[PDB]
Amino acid sequence: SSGLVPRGSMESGFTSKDTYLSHFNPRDYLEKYYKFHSAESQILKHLLKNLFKIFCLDGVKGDLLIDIGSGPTIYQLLSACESFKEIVVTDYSDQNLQELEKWLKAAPAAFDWSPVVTYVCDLEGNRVKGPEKEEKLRQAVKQVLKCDVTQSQPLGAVPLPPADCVLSTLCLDAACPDLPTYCRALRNLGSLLKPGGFLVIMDALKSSYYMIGEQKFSSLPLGREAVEAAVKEAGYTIEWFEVISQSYSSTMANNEGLFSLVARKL
Numbered sequence: 001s002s003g004l005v006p007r008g009s010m011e012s013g014f015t016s017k018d019t020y021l022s023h024f025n026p027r028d029y030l031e032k033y034y035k036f037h038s039a040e041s042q043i044l045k046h047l048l049k050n051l052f053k054i055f056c057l058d059g060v061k062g063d064l065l066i067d068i069g070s071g072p073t074i075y076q077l078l079s080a081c082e083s084f085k086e087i088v089v090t091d092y093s094d095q096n097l098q099e100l101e102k103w104l105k106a107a108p109a110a111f112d113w114s115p116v117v118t119y120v121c122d123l124e125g126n127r128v129k130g131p132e133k134e135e136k137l138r139q140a141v142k143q144v145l146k147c148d149v150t151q152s153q154p155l156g157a158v159p160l161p162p163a164d165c166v167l168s169t170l171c172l173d174a175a176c177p178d179l180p181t182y183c184r185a186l187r188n189l190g191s192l193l194k195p196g197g198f199l200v201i202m203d204a205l206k207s208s209y210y211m212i213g214e215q216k217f218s219s220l221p222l223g224r225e226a227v228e229a230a231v232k233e234a235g236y237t238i239e240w241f242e243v244i245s246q247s248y249s250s251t252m253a254n255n256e257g258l259f260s261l262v263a264r265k266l
């Protein structure tokens with residue numbers, strides 16, 4: 001369908017799961033949004049300050065954190081590895097999981113997160129340097145699993161203890177074709193959480209597509225209200241909800257800002 005409509009969406013209107021296994025390139029994605037005063041860096045700086053505030057300034061701590069739809073990225077776990085003993089990274093895409101495993105073993109061919117790590121280190125008061133912080137995160141990531149938000153058991157039949165937190169960054173908008181699927185995916189992740197467990201979500205507002213170069217992928221256009229309502233219906237109580245008006249470059253997405261939320265599983 002070239003560029004009229006997102007890839008894998010001609011039939012259903014939304015990018016199909018197998019499009020993420022076939023046309024999602026981890027290296028390309030990382031080079032597009034995570035190299036670094038672009039729109040992409042300003043959003044990543046906001047994302048990092050929010051994760052720093054949630055995990056380090058606020059009481060978002062425990063033993064196990066599960067990251068849902070991690071992709072090939074690790075920026076979302078930097079501040080979290082300070083409050084959680086264990087972290088499980090998950091994604092639907094095996095090529096994404098392989099990119100994480102390169103980084104986990106500090107393979108020379110893995111993506112360089114050094115600028116991002118230095119930035120989280122400066123935010124955190126410079127108690128440690130970049131290489132020390134990287135090793136603490138690497139040591140905290142205990143599992144790298146296959147994930148599928150649309151399944152009642154998202155991690156398949158992998159026995160895991162109940163988690164104290166479930167973090168999901170820029171995944172749910174890309175994975176859920178409508179509000180009922182979005183609500184059901186929030187219920188599915190709740191099955192991984194202890195009662196009173198934390199749900200941390202950060203995603204785009206009113207975006208119908210996002211790009212990896214010239215490959216167009218679907219996004220669920222959500223407003224502030226629809227996210228609030230779907231989170232509440234899924235069995236959660238919102239602790240806090242933030243909305244930034246900052247959007248990605250016009251050549252990469254049509255988002256009208258982003259949101260951050262901390263909710264509690266009822």
Ligand SMILES: Nc1ncnc2c1ncn2[C@@H]1O[C@H](CSCC[C@H](N)C(=O)O)[C@@H](O)[C@H]1O
Pocket residue numbers: 017020024068069070071072073076091092093096147148149150168169170171172174175
């Ligand atoms: N049904 C599904 N279940 C779980 N993850 C899914 C999914 N469909 C798509 N995804 C994943 O959702 C991600 C969207 S990109 C988000 C990457 C990363 N967390 C970040 O913040 O940059 C992709 O890595 C894709 O593989």
Ligand SMILES: CN1Cc2cccc3c2N(CCC3)C1=N
Pocket residue numbers: 033170171173174204207209210218219220248252253254255
């Ligand atoms: C890094 N980006 C930019 C982006 C921009 C607008 C919408 C969406 C995204 N997503 C996935 C979720 C949907 C990403 N992963």
